[PDB]
Symmetry: D2
Subunit: 403 residues, 4 copies
């Protein structure tokens, strides 16, 4: 009833839009008995009601952009007063056009029983972002950086992104400190890249892997001098953000030491199978599946929550920044985070003119309680796409890259 | 936000389990979370917490049994029915504490200090308890052993256990919302099962032939067959008179077809209004009508829900359709409107296998993945006909059947 | 749907409130500091609100038409009561908006009471429009509540009677004698007696229904004795056909079990001895002693226990029954509030019973006060949700004005 | 933030805890009129143990709360985040057992332990604590009792007993009136009773104080022996003002009040308020008051919310502290707060040894959405009692003062 365990463990903006859309739906749309005559009329009016609302939100976003532009780098944006937990909008969003296009496909205005869904709005928001970047191309601030979530139909589109002179970064929560591992699982991307004759080697090496959220950076290399292809680790000094440089190594190791100890305690208390392994690396410590032998989500969630709470009461850990991740059957504790990794890549690709958030798009699937490495953090560093299927990713990439 | 559209859709969620979750949360926050951070004696805390959880489950056991006795009456209500008003009938005693202690070993529930006992935890405990019961009745003098196991249709590690079930002398039926009126389709769909059963040496033919397919929810019945003169196997259609329940035989054909005709017209209206692509096609059969994806192609989720909600509401205002029970299903990316229901299908099978001594609900177990808003063909209706297992993964089915059939 | 009170267990108003929340956030809160746009902001907000109410009017009309023969509104709001009359929602909003300045608010959304006020104003508006036409269904019966075991409403009751409108007071007290209600309503009968401007014939159209629908009394003025007061109308005249088939033994068995149940509750709750149990012909109840009163938790415990207990008692379900814990009293009565209103509708004109569309129940018991709540009165006719005596007076003034 | 819809999380948290034994051991046993004593006894035992557990949690929080006080958090703060500060130990079980005897909470089978049940228990426990310290050797006994004075009798005797018992009594109001006359005219009878009461020394008589504008004006009862002059006398600010308040800029104070006065004048035109409603401006406060004419609770809350959020975006107001009150028909904007008001009185009575929060009990009837001057703010300065009825105040004071 009243959950006493509620605070021990949703996108408000989207639910907000859903509420605004539901009011005309229940009043005008819910007119089920109707196809005898007035359902063209009902659909038409309902479509207009929805379109108007999205157009109103368009202006609210643009007002927020302007307010945030001048007053940031204490007032509040209108939209921020309406939606307190809303994230920054680095780009304009043609919501009305996006809706009308999606309504063409899925006939949302033509429904009388099923209100505009969370997925409906999510698709509109994603379509709007893509539409924005395509608009700049036929003029603006075009898309310079696309990032993906590591922790196949997508592989070709990655290659063409690179050919179109767009930097591609793969952000993973994996704490592996050796290139070799990433070469072993990103095999297909590496060899298909390598084996492709079209791409100049310059564009070929614009592919990067930001491991440990923002702990390790690897870049693609092609040395057919040796016919050696794969990923080369980049020295910290080139890609490390200034604030991260200030972190003491002692606090880093102390943080990782305390984390690894906490993991082992959790292991014993939870009496986890011995096939479950705790892996410690240079900038990361994590727990991994075994043999077949996996971990329950409650166990994964217990681990992340325990790690976050303990470390947040650990002084070395607060003098730095850390992230936790429990997406798959693995829980990773890494130094840094999603936002830091994306912004590091922005500076890395062009130090003289760092890639702006307005020119950055993070196609991510970790908009969930996957930990502090959630893709909501990525909204701090740039524009994002919210994908729920690999096909969704391909669809979005296809329309983006369509001439 | 006050969702003004809430009541337009089905938002059924197992109140009994949520009720159990709420009870377990009180010892959790006062004993588990109150000793979060305690580096020393974790074992003591886990033991006290587990004991508190176990006591609660044993209390619920008692409530369940009392209800079973108070439902043997037939208007008062069981004490449990007062606590949880939407509770279903318990055809069988549930060893909940034993099931909790077993799952607590696997899932380590009592050891957690941050994450409370979950819905899935209770679901696992409830399912394990249902299995544990039937395993107890096997050796028992006057125990009611499991006679019928039912599955949901609409290579595969379930097939061996289905074969093992049949060999163990247990009747197995598959209830599919598909409305196809030919045995050929189900032979094509379930070719993996029929081939393995055909190739199974350890199972006598009488036990093999104890495999049935309930086409529609209760519209068509098919039985496995193995010709003794020729190497021909597959599925045979059974005449209506042998398996059709009395009330179903009382149903008028004209109302049946009026319903299906109305449903078919309603489907094409929806097709136009939602401007669905031309390959989405609408298929009409003898006792069922449905809309299926085509190729060049598929239907959105919300569109599928729009269809079943439309069909259900419209037909529930159709007089011939109230004289004759019907069902809708949008689980896959198809929507099928079938005459009858899942409840009817299970009890039809209960009668068919042994007409003279019909299989009781206490001897029936439906393994279902459709305990969801999948229309009126949901597995909550199967709780009317007998005991159920709530499965969320195919691996759960395998594990559940493994525990049951383990010697 | 639990029968036991764990937390604070009208959906239509909350549904409307949710609707009104959309223009509030998108068009009002967005303009909190736009102090020169106050004219345009308020105008747009007022139109947005008014458009919603106009839309709900249509859905209500659809519900009425459908119920004349679920409705969309029933699908949207499953706990919605029947609308016996159409309501002018848009105008009611605009009128109340002038007084309350709802559209000018940027920090506070349209409230529950805002809508309740608008709904009440709409109901009164409807009758007034019907009135001037006279052609339409005019208000013939107004019912009030005095259910519990200084008043400016009295002159308006008198004005209602002089306007040829029948006035009934429905009460859950369940006392079986006229003298008690004469004393409780002394101010009303004195004022009515002292009124020279009202014909005795019209004075006689004042009735009181005790025990929800168990006892009926009428106002009388006889020249011979030269007094006045209340005379109990015989059962044959006002009893509904459903109630006539009710067996006396079931009635007695119901009350006897209820009285027994009350006595154990006294024991177990260790209630003070000053607390007494009163038994009447068609009612049994627990009343506060002497100040010695009962906690609301205790009163709720009593009503919930009785309802659950009696609804599992075969004689009681061959019967209808009601419980009421409004004040610091709990009464178990044979009748029901809907039955009382329906009985009065027949009593005044047996040939052509007063239609629900010509009936208005001004009630203050739209609360968890047991099965005797005023939501039951919505079954028998139109209603008015009042929170203050001033509200009643205000609503009655608008109703009876030129 | 804006308000769409309409308590105390700690009480709700305890209610949810007590609800679990209720459903299983009480609701289940309805219809069982035999065995009811046994059922009641067990149910009582279950409830009591929960309270004893919560007692322990409080003692732990208090000791953790010795770490800082004007990282991490108490386990109670994790479970209930919006929980206030407990300056004293609370005998919850003893209080429950007493309240269960009076209210028969454990005997109920259909009605769970209510919000009011717990509230009474918490209030009783607070009283119980101070009574034991009166017993104990040199225990931190009650030294300051504060009351609310509202804005534009059985309680009077108990105040006198408090004063005669050597307990300092203060009355805090949101009224912005800066003249002693208004309060001699508002607190008549009490002054007369104190003047007429021969059984009280005038030294103890003077321990009665009035805090106006929450913490803006201080008036102390005076009684000249030879000239028959009695009433309230304003105390000079340097004597009772807290240091932080002394450092406040008069300009910022004035600028804040002037902004509020214009905001108030804006609101009355916007809301088209009647001309009978008058706006009152004082030295340390500005307010809106009813006419000869009254204001809706929506209008009252609109004004408070508007004023509150507006001034929070006003820099001079940020550099000061302000409070708002809409309990009565009036809406007052006063410089300071109830918290600052109580604490100022704590130093005023005895500057060499300021009265501690553990020695201060605030009996208040404003634990509601009354604005920033609510009694929840008083929990920052000391112990409190939640009052819903005037008779509750009388009964509570009686039990506190009984011997
Ligand atoms: O609260 C938010 N919800 C959705 N998108 C947001 C939000 N805040 C900032 N953005 C941005 O809006 C675009 C919509 O797809 C994305 O670029 C997302 O990052
Ligand atoms: O409300 C219910 N929730 C869970 N199971 C129920 C319910 N009602 C009857 N049963 C039965 O209890 C067993 C354990 O899940 C299953 O057999 C189920 O069908
Ligand atoms: O769910 C309802 N809420 C409020 N009023 C209702 C409802 N159902 C029917 N009516 C009627 O609407 C008028 C306005 O208050 C009243 O006449 C009431 O009886
Ligand atoms: O969240 C709280 N709820 C109730 N009381 C609290 C809370 N926080 C601190 N105290 C203190 O506990 C005593 C009992 O009510 C009071 O002294 C109150 O100020």
């Amino acid at each position: 009833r009243y959950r006493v365990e509620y605070h021990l463990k949703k996108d408000e903006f989207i639910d907000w839009v859903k509420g605004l859309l539901a009011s005309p739906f229940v009043l005008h749309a819910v007119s089920h008995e109707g196809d005898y005559n007035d359902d063209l009329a009902t659909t038409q009016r309902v479509r207009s009601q929805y379109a108007d609302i999205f157009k109103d939100i368009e202006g609210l976003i643009k007002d927020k952009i302007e307010f945030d532009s001048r007053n940031m780098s204490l007032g509040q944006s209108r939209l921020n007063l309406l939606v307190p937990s809303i994230g920054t909008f680095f780009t304009e969003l043609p919501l009305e056009q996006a809706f009308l296009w999606e309504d063409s496909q899925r006939a949302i205005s033509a429904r009388r029983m099923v209100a505009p869904s969370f997925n409906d709005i999510r698709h509109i928001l994603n379509t709007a972002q893509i539409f924005h970047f395509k608009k700049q191309e036929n003029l603006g601030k075009v898309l310079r950086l696309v990032t993906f979530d590591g922790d196949n139909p997508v592989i070709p589109y990655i290659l063409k992104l690179l050919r179109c002179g767009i930097n591609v970064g793969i952000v993973t929560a994996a704490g592996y400190d050796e290139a070799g591992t990433y070469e072993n699982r990103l095999k297909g991307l590496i060899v298909a890249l390598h084996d492709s004759t079209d791409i100049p080697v310059s564009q070929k090496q614009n592919l990067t892997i930001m491991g440990g959220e923002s702990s390790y950076l690897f870049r693609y290399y092609e040395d057919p001098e040796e016919d050696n292809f794969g990923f080369r680790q980049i020295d910290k000094e080139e890609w490390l953000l200034p604030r991260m440089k200030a972190w003491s190594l002692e606090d880093v190791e102390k943080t990782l030491d305390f984390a690894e100890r906490t993991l082992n305690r959790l292991r014993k208390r939870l009496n986890l199978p011995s096939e479950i392994s705790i892996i410690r690396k240079v900038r990361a410590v994590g727990i991994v599946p075994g043999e077949p032998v996996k971990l329950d989500r409650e166990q994964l969630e217990e681990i992340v929550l325990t790690l976050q709470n303990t470390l947040e009461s650990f002084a070395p850990s607060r003098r730095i920044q850390f992230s936790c991740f429990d997406g798959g059957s693995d829980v990773w504790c890494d130094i840094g985070g999603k936002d830091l990794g994306v912004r590091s890549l922005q500076q890395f690709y062009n130090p003289e003119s760092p890639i702006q958030p307005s020119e950055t798009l993070h196609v991510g699937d970790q908009f969930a309680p996957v930990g502090s490495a959630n893709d909501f953090k990525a909204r701090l560093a740039g524009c994002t796409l919210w994908i729920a299927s690999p096909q969704e990713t391909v669809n979005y990439l296809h329309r983006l890259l369509e001439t």
